[PDB]
Amino acid sequence: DKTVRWCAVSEHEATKCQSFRDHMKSVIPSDGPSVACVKKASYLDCIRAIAANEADAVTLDAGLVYDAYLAPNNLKPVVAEFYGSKEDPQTFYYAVAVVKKDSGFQMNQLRGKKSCHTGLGRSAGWNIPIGLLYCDLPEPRKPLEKAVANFFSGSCAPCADGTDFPQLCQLCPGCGCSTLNQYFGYSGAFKCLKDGAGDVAFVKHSTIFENLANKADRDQYELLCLDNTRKPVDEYKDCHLAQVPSHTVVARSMGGKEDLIWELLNQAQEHFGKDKSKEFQLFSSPHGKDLLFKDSAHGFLKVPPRMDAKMYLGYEYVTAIRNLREGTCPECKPVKWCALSHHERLKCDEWSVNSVGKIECVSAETTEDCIAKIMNGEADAMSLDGGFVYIAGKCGLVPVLAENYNKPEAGYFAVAVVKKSASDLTWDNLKGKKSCHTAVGRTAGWNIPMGLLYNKINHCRFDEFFSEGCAPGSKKDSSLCKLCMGSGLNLCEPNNKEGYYGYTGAFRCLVEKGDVAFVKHQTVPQNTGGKNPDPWAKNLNEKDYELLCLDGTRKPVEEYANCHLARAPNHAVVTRKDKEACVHKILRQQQHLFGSNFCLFRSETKDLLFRDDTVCLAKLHDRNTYEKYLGEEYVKAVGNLRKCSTSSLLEACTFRRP
Ligand SMILES: [Yb+3]
């Protein structure tokens, strides 16, 4: 059986589920998926059941998504309800903090202000902002209503205990827990702000648009961002307290059966979803409202499979709820650095102990795994090629420091290298030629050359432009894995175990099999004239190699400052905004101790943790966003390249922010 065991939490839900089960048998052939209904007492019992392999799937609110991730349940999100419409699906809401234009305070200055909450125990209006403010609340922080009452000067907090904590009901006396109270619910807490009762209103990204039809009125309001700046009310995507998923189907992390759940639901919506008019309706029931799924849903979207709970919920949300659940506060902290290999980890361990606990080391199998650890706070920083920066930025991380090479730089150089003998080659036409790339999605190897190349052919299907090639990171069955030299599983893998990976590897590829290699300006120099002693490079001479220039002409290798494709954003350190300052300070205190003269920018193997050309770590000034650092033309290009290129982390991050 390809049976899916759906978990109900009430008798009404179970009846619907039995009917779901029955009607599915009419539209699904007997090789396809079917439904079993497992009735439980509560969402938590459902969670345990799923984890105990006694059920397979249930649909949850965000807090419960959090519970289900925790050990020993270890469930994850697999399918998402969407709302709104087919065309612009609404999967998340944002919890925001709204304030009056010119009230002149920031998120770190809410102590002593007047607050408006939608209601005690609601998410956007209470659990999130109070969770984020948890550690700014005065001791003792239990009971929590008391500490909140001693934080804001007065408030409207519906359903709070005004008898014991009158400050919480000062702006809505009694704390009316119903619409009889004018300051209740979303519109209510917003009104409390609009009427001048209070200074901040903790609500959803959409409340203000629902209560103020004119842009001119809305310009009177702003949002508090967590970095302690402010933004317009329609920039909530970049200025919110948390991004919250509305309703999420969850399943086991291992043993799923995620594939099957999506097949079941995706066909359920096909035949019984919104506007389908059968007598069985997936998103309603005579037996009651919001059974199994919300009656307001318009369908399901499949959650990208790189996604775990902490990533889906988001850094901010998880911080808020962890604070409420654990209730643990501290009293600038060690920077957790992310290492990708045994050779990187070793350098880091020794860095760790040299700095006296000021640095610590976390490691992961791949760059994307390290990025995901930074995203969710398992780790704090790592240095990255411009192509990963783009990816990290799309995932909400920011660049804090550039690696420097000269003696605030315009960047290293991207060149196209060819063999001198094969003289027919020119930039103006490489169609049908063989190509070597450092890896797909990297600055020099891919984003620049293929960027430019995209503008000339207007599609990113390069395995059909070139004949064959080696471009580590491509789909193994592609023509751009044909020249690669890894064996077995390592073929075309974008790491060391594939010998044509990296700048050097891409040059090796040119030497042995290719017609053009896309590398940086110092790649050929450093792997010729005996400098590289490996058999393949040992006997080579840089005079036998030429660069392709954008005219159509060529030039000797060392004449690169006139024969490059484009300038290249330096590799850069990235982190979370909430650590930009501590990273920015800890590292400048570490490079003025181990920089240029244990050595930080020198390594045992080659280019570990930071590149070895790196003399110093630079300030970025204004250019501390991925788009302000990479620059408009880089991003415009990569945008075009995304159409054909995968990356599973980028698929996950853009599910959350398209
Ligand atoms: Yb690079």
Give an overview in words:
The chain has 658 residues and is an alpha+beta fold. The chain folds into 4 domains: 1-92 and 245-331, D-Maltodextrin-Binding Protein, domain 2 (3-Layer(aba) Sandwich); 93-244, 3-Layer(aba) Sandwich (D-Maltodextrin-Binding Protein, domain 2); 332-411 and 569-658, Periplasmic binding protein-like II (D-Maltodextrin-Binding Protein, domain 2, 3-Layer(aba) Sandwich); 412-568, Periplasmic binding protein-like II (D-Maltodextrin-Binding Protein, domain 2, 3-Layer(aba) Sandwich), CATH 3.40.190. It contains 22 helices and 27 strands. Strand 4 and strand 5 form a beta hairpin. The two termini are 37 Å apart. Ytterbium (III) ion is lined by residues 385, 442-444, 571. Disulfide bonds join 7-46, 17-37, 116-192, 135-329, 156-172, 159-177, 169-175, 225-239, 332-582, 338-370, 348-361, 395-653, 436-509, 460-644, 470-484, 481-492, 549-563.
Which tags fit this structure?
monomer; 658 residues; alpha+beta; D-Maltodextrin-Binding Protein, domain 2; 4 domains; seven-stranded mixed beta sheet; 22 helices; 27 strands; globular; binds ytterbium (III) ion; metal transport; Transferrin; ytterbium; ferric
